Symmetry: D2
Subunit: 112 residues, 4 copies
């Protein structure tokens, strides 16, 4: 009964990044899920839980380019799809990986 | 005559991350280069320059897992290969993308 | 009925920083509060709320040095007291300012 | 013959933060220096060197509020003066402490 959640903050305006598409995939495979953050910059249902959450490597494709585009970065943005690889060791643990995001930089961390 | 350089700092000990392997690839392709940072956590020759640097999307595969492993994170580390996608718009510009790295989090930015 | 909360994550081990002392003070004054984070790296009661929360500048003194010391950085640590100044404009708003912390670097942000 | 340098990057536009005032002071004292970053977001002469650099705690007052103000955050900005405390142990070592800055968050690290 593990769990994988996330969270996006736009450091340009201190608000949660809303309606950003997030791709989810197992390492070496194709997208398996596609979600859009709510107003809190989170997703209602965990990105992964129970059976689903299998120990291994995953990748999340945060669509930063489109998000900043709507809030305005340019025709060929520096950040298009912020990609995040990570390995989930224990299948019964909680993994909260937020994303602090800016047009030209970002923080990826295992928060609480 | 554009240029792509990078830099790795281990925020766990304030020192540059040395001898870390860095994979380089164009979006959707296979590795095209493989380098190992020196003692300053940089690479002698630009990761990309002149002809090579074509406008588009690239990906750098920082091998964080192995680096921390040598400095010690575990059998199934949270971070294995920190992956970084980005788009290089102008082919004649300088792009310096450093990496602030920690066992459980990291910063990716367009520095100077 | 505004609110000021915070949160500390130790990026060295992906866990919340527990029992870290946090000083709170208005700009130019002496400490007014002193708290110790719980196991979630948070404090049970808001650091500021209602009447208390007056528009202006505050400072939080995160005692990183002692925290890392207990988990081990040295005799004269790089980070001793991570100091964070910020201005609270609206008195009725919620301000969540977490702290991503490492022996040699840290992130300060207005999260959700 | 130690050295203290710094560097400011505006993560909102990937450029160095130019002409930002930086206050320098020893712990518990008044400003001792006041500098303004050049176009590279650095200062020509080290903020501290040789004799000057004495082992102990210092504080740098990055004037983020004014900088973003000129580039535009509001009347009562979240960040006014980003304050950074740190301890310099060895007097003969090089300490490079850059600042990744955004209207609502920032990274402080011991870079190379
Ligand atoms: O949902 C979250 N809550 C928090 O308090 C937090 N702190 N960092 N990341 C976080 N994510
Ligand atoms: O090579 C670099 N030099 C610097 O001064 C710097 N600051 N941030 N990233 C950087 N990379």
């Amino acid at each position: 009964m593990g769990k994988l959640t996330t969270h996006i903050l736009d450091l340009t305006c201190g608000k949660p990044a809303a309606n950003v598409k997030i791709g989810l995939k197992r390492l070496g495979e194709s997208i398996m899920k596609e979600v859009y953050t709510n107003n809190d910059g989170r997703v209602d249902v965990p990105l992964l839980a129970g059976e689903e959450l299998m120990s291994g490597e995953y990748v999340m494709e945060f669509h930063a380019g489109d998000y900043f585009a709507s809030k305005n970065a340019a025709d060929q943005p520096f950040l298009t799809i912020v990609t995040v690889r990570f390995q989930l060791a224990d299948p019964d643990a909680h993994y909260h990986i937020p994303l602090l995001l800016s047009p030209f930089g970002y923080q990826v961390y295992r928060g609480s």
